[PDB]
Design an enzyme around this catalytic site. Structure first.
Site, PDB file in Angstrom:
ATOM      1  CG  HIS A 205      -4.801   8.966   5.659  1.00 54.19           C
ATOM      2  ND1 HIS A 205      -3.523   9.066   6.183  1.00 54.19           N
ATOM      3  CD2 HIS A 205      -4.943   7.683   5.238  1.00 54.19           C
ATOM      4  CE1 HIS A 205      -2.919   7.894   6.082  1.00 54.19           C
ATOM      5  NE2 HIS A 205      -3.758   7.035   5.520  1.00 54.19           N
TER       6      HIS A 205
ATOM      7  CG  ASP B 167      -0.241   8.426   3.823  1.00 52.38           C
ATOM      8  OD1 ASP B 167       0.435   8.490   4.893  1.00 52.38           O
ATOM      9  OD2 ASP B 167      -0.927   7.441   3.491  1.00 52.38           O
TER      10      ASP B 167
ATOM     11  CE1 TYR C  31      -4.091  -0.637  -4.127  1.00 54.59           C
ATOM     12  CE2 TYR C  31      -1.935   0.393  -3.883  1.00 54.59           C
ATOM     13  CZ  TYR C  31      -3.294   0.401  -3.654  1.00 54.59           C
ATOM     14  OH  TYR C  31      -3.774   1.493  -2.933  1.00 54.59           O
TER      15      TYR C  31
ATOM     16  CG  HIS D 138       0.359   7.092  -0.737  1.00 49.93           C
ATOM     17  ND1 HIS D 138      -0.485   6.186  -1.333  1.00 49.93           N
ATOM     18  CD2 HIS D 138       0.440   6.722   0.563  1.00 49.93           C
ATOM     19  CE1 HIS D 138      -0.922   5.317  -0.431  1.00 49.93           C
ATOM     20  NE2 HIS D 138      -0.368   5.619   0.729  1.00 49.93           N
TER      21      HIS D 138
ATOM     22  CD  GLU E 145      -2.106   4.267  -3.814  1.00 50.88           C
ATOM     23  OE1 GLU E 145      -2.381   3.514  -2.866  1.00 50.88           O
ATOM     24  OE2 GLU E 145      -1.540   5.385  -3.645  1.00 50.88           O
TER      25      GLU E 145
ATOM     26  CD  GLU F  91      -4.903   4.790  -0.190  1.00 51.02           C
ATOM     27  OE1 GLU F  91      -5.875   4.035  -0.420  1.00 51.02           O
ATOM     28  OE2 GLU F  91      -4.340   4.828   0.918  1.00 51.02           O
TER      29      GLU F  91
ATOM     30  CG  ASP G 124      -1.743  12.058   5.913  1.00 51.24           C
ATOM     31  OD1 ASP G 124      -1.914  11.740   4.706  1.00 51.24           O
ATOM     32  OD2 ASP G 124      -2.251  11.401   6.861  1.00 51.24           O
TER      33      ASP G 124
END
Ligand code: ATP
Ligand SMILES: *[C@@H]1O[C@H](CO)[C@@H](O[C@@H]2O[C@H](CO)[C@@H](O)[C@H](O)[C@H]2NC(C)=O)[C@H](O)[C@H]1NC(C)=O
Ligand code: CA
Ligand code: CA
Ligand code: MG
Lengths: 17, 260, 361
Positions: free
Chosen positions: B252, B168, B76, B134, B78, B39, B212
């Protein structure tokens, strides 16, 4: 020098890039 | 060799500019010889540079990094960030999963896994790879299943059986239910050991979910895992934090494991 | 046997091929070296980034600007930039191409010699030339006498040129340009109540400057108009989706060029420096300068700037002087364009300095 300034004033046709 | 995967909610400039939050994030990270951070929402790599400045303020080579371009299906985006102590391991090679074409990784994964080959003289495993994922919550089953194909791609590329797959995975609760585990080859194939169990709580929130995970393949790597060492790290309990401060760090917990 | 034209500025490198009408490559004049050890996924360790990639990875780098106010001050960094220009941007072998480079007005001779030395010894060019930026802008406009106002990212100069001869004693340098204007736009938007904290947010301000700002013909009147009505407001949509609206900042920002006190500087504004430059020149040529005031460089792109310059110079000049401001639509690339022209003229070809000549010097 004179010849150069003469050409500068007269312009050149530039191509699309 | 202590390894972790940690989803740090919207890790970025604002979080790293907060001296208290930075302080706890640095303390967490320094526990580990290799930690994967997900993230990362850092358009110009300023937050990553800031974390490294803290980590390396007394010894310029305390930690080295591996970081991706911004990844995502849509706008979006990451990054994956690996931070590793170069006196413990060396990075031999890295690549981002492709599926054989420029933008084919996005056919099966929102954030195409980053894959890193390490050299490690202090463990029984000498070379192993880590695959970061992720997953997209709404595509969790398919993406965790596709990690099987990533493992096959690592095998063909690097002729390596020793591979840890972590991050994750959103692997629990409404995103992967009990009945669905049988459709996930990473789980049904006996090639893989799941080190964080379905019972584990890896969220700093009031949900009880094993999102995770840390999965290992390769007989040498499996033999290197210290029994009982894989667990979430509950930093709220460790640092005696309020739930509110804890949630300011992330939603997390890190998941961790030790190799010998 | 196609020449290269490389126009190196304080903020941007404009680079391309002689004979073309625009640079092929425009990118930030920046070099960044990693502050820490590591790699981008799938890449090896890089010792430096140049240009766009340096900007976008800046948070893990230390950045250097090797051109300061038009002048090269860091040669190892400048070499990196030229290396990156040849091989990465234009994808050429520099040993195969005569290369025309540009320099700032009043560039020290030792600086031009170091440029020449690198191009020949480091890059092995067959031939090269260095032209003065402002003179090329004038050439680009089809003229040989006039006064150039060249305003870029780092520096503003006035340069009077008489039959091709830039008059060094009359050159004015003003250390206020595009960068100062972006920084001031950020300051005054902040005063309004907006906030530019993250790198991404701060990066936007330069785009707001270039899209919404303009020069008021009558500053004081434009201020009262802005206070009187919402007629001068304009909206700017942020990358996310939020729309924001700005009024008087649109013209306060570049008004700084005419009133440097807006950023705390005690210097004359660009209309005063244009006049004083013309006034250092023989009275007999002034009429030719007034009638041929050529504007060049990114920071001359504001809507309104030519009209306001015509107005301020008219107020300073003799009452009978015919005054003309020439601001070509392409003027952000005029220096490069003049270079493209010059390097393609037949009368220029004897003017290249060859490798052979440099070796025998
Ligand atoms: N449309 C526009 N309106 C206002 N400013 C602009 C516009 N386009 C570009 N600029 C500004 O022009 C500057 C760059 O122009 P230019 O390439 O002429 O400068 P440079 O050669 O890098 O710098 P210098 O001449 O000072 O050494 C930047 O500050 C940029 O923000
Ligand atoms: C750093 O982060 C913390 C935690 O989010 C911020 O403290 C919270 O923010 C406000 C302060 O105005 C209050 O709601 C609480 O006092 C804080 N919450 C907790 C959990 O303690 C802190 O303000 C941040 N620091 C800065 C300078 O922004
Ligand atoms: Ca929980
Ligand atoms: Ca320039
Ligand atoms: Mg559970």
């Amino acid at each position: 020098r004179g010849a150069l300034l003469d050409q500068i004033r007269q312009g050149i046709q530039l191509n699309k890039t | 060799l202590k390894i972790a995967a940690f989803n740090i909610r919207t890790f970025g400039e604002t979080k790293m500019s907060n001296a208290t939050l930075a302080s706890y994030i640095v303390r967490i990270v320094r526990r580990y010889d290799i930690v994967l951070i997900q993230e990362v929402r850092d358009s110009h790599l300023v937050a990553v540079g800031k974390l490294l400045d803290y980590l390396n303020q007394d010894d310029p080579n305390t930690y080295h990094y591996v970081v991706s371009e911004p990844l995502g299906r849509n706008s979006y985006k990451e990054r994956y960030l690996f931070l590793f102590r170069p006196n413990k391991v060396s990075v031999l090679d890295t690549y981002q999963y492709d599926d054989g074409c420029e933008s084919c990784g996005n056919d099966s994964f929102s954030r195409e896994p980053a894959v890193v080959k390490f050299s490690s003289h202090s463990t029984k495993v000498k070379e192993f790879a880590i695959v970061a994922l992720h997953s997209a919550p709404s595509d969790a089953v398919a993406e965790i299943n596709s990690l099987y194909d990533v493992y096959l791609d690592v095998q063909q590329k690097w002729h390596l059986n020793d591979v840890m797959l972590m991050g994750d995975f959103n692997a629990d609760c409404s995103y992967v239910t009990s009945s669905q585990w049988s459709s996930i080859r990473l789980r049904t194939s006996s090639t893989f050991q799941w080190l964080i169990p379905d019972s584990a709580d890896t969220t700093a929130t009031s949900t009880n979910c094993a999102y995770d995970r840390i999965v290992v393949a390769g007989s040498l790597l499996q033999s290197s895992v210290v029994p009982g060492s894989a667990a979430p790290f509950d930093f709220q309990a460790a640092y005696g934090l309020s739930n509110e401060m804890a949630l300011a760090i992330s939603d997390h917990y890190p998941v961790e494991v030790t190799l010998t | 046997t196609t020449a290269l034209v490389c126009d190196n500025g304080s903020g941007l490198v404009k680079a391309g091929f002689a004979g073309d009408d625009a640079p092929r490559a425009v990118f930030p004049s920046i070099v960044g070296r990693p502050r820490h050890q590591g790699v981008m996924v799938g890449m090896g360790q890089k010792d430096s980034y140049v240009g766009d990639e340096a900007q976008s990875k800046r948070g893990i780098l230390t950045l250097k600007y090797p051109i300061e106010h038009g002048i090269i001050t860091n040669w190892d960094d400048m070499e990196k930039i030229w290396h990156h220009t040849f091989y990465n941007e234009l994808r050429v072998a520099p040993e195969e191409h005569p290369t025309l480079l540009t320099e700032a007005p009043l560039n020290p001779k030792a600086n031009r010699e170091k440029m020449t030395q690198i191009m020949f010894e480091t890059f092995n060019v067959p031939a090269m030339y260095v032209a003065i930026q402002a003179v090329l802008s004038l050439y680009a406009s089809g003229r040989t006498t006039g006064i150039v106002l060249d305003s870029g990212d780092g520096v503003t100069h006035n340069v009077p040129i008489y039959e091709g001869y830039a008059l060094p004693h009359a050159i004015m340098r003003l250390d206020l340009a595009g960068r100062d204007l972006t920084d001031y736009l950020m300051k005054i938007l902040t005063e309004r109540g907006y906030s530019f904290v993250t790198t991404a947010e701060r990066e936007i301000v330069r785009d707001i400057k270039e899209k919404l700002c303009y020069v008021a013909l009558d500053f004081e009147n434009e201020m009262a108009t802005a206070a009187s009505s919402s007629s001068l407001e304009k909206s700017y949509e942020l990358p996310d989706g939020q729309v924001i609206t700005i009024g008087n900042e649109r013209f306060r920002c570049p008004e700084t060029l005419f009133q440097p006190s807006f950023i705390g500087m005690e210097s004359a504004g660009i209309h005063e420096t244009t006049y004083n430059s013309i006034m250092k020149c023989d009275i007999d040529i002034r009429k030719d300068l007034y009638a041929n005031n050529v504007m060049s460089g990114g920071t001359t792109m504001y809507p309104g700037i030519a009209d306001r310059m015509q107005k301020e110079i008219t107020a300073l000049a003799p009452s009978t002087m015919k005054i003309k401001i020439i601001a070509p639509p392409e003027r952000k690339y005029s220096v490069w364009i003049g270079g493209s022209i010059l390097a393609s003229l037949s009368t220029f070809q004897q003017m290249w300095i060859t490798k052979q000549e440099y070796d025998e010097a």
